[PDB]
Amino acid sequence: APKVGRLIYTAGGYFRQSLSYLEAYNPSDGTWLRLADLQVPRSGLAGCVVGGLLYAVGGRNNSPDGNTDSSALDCYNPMTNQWSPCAPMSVPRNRIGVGVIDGHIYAVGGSHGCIHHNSVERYEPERDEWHLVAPMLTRRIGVGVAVLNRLLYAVGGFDGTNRLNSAECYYPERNEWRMITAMNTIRSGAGVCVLHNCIYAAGGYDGQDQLNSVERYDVETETWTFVAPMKHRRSALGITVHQGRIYVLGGYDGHTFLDSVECYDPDTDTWSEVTRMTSGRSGVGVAVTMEPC
């Protein structure tokens, strides 16, 4: 499962306006590479990888001259250092969550102006097509998404009125969503990922405060348990897993757009500062793939 040469890629984000950056961090040597800018600035997007290709999904371009929610899907090839447009989603989705099952990208929730989506759609890379699947039971913007054992999980978010502690799971062979146990904490904008047999939710926003707490859902026991908290409170953070550890990148804490990156070791239940992004930002997309040629 592990292989040499993988980097943590961070795309887009927000600081004063939506950003076009693509930068890649190498845990083996501590370096950052600046790669080709996104074609369109975007914050509130999600990243993922299929077949060694990085995808940037959804978001919004908050710019000097407008706020435009994005239906775009764009693909970055590390081999060529080029972005290529793909077929767009059916609807713009800012503050989206994404997950990959069996080579297919699921785009979950998000907002379009005052519309809070519960809809969900699935992208087929070889065919370059999106199709709608069953909608979630709850409208969720700022939703955390992760995949474990070929099941898709949508965690927390904001329904337009309340921030959510609820979570739900999509069962592909039934094209059906079912609620799971609710989190201990209301979290909009949490970082959500999978590590071992658990879905982690780190940070986020409860409507009053950005959070440093972290909890994990054991898919067998159906319980949420707190683990050690991050050193820095943060919402709208990027997250990924690499070599058995969770990395959280940036975010917002009410005072600062963070450049902090923290790394969680589950065997010691400890967080450790690892590196700082080149500039503070929130609302990034993150994923891991092989280093650029």
Ligand SMILES: CCOc1cccnc1Cc1ccc([C@H](F)C(=O)N[C@H](c2ccc(C)cc2)[C@@H](C)C(=O)O)cc1
């Ligand atoms: C000071 C202006 O800051 C801006 C302006 C424009 C864009 N981004 C920011 C930064 C920011 C401000 C507030 C926050 C809040 F903690 C926070 O998580 N919110 C949620 C949220 C979830 C996911 C994402 C990606 C963004 C925001 C939303 C759904 C909510 O629950 O309401 C988080 C980040």
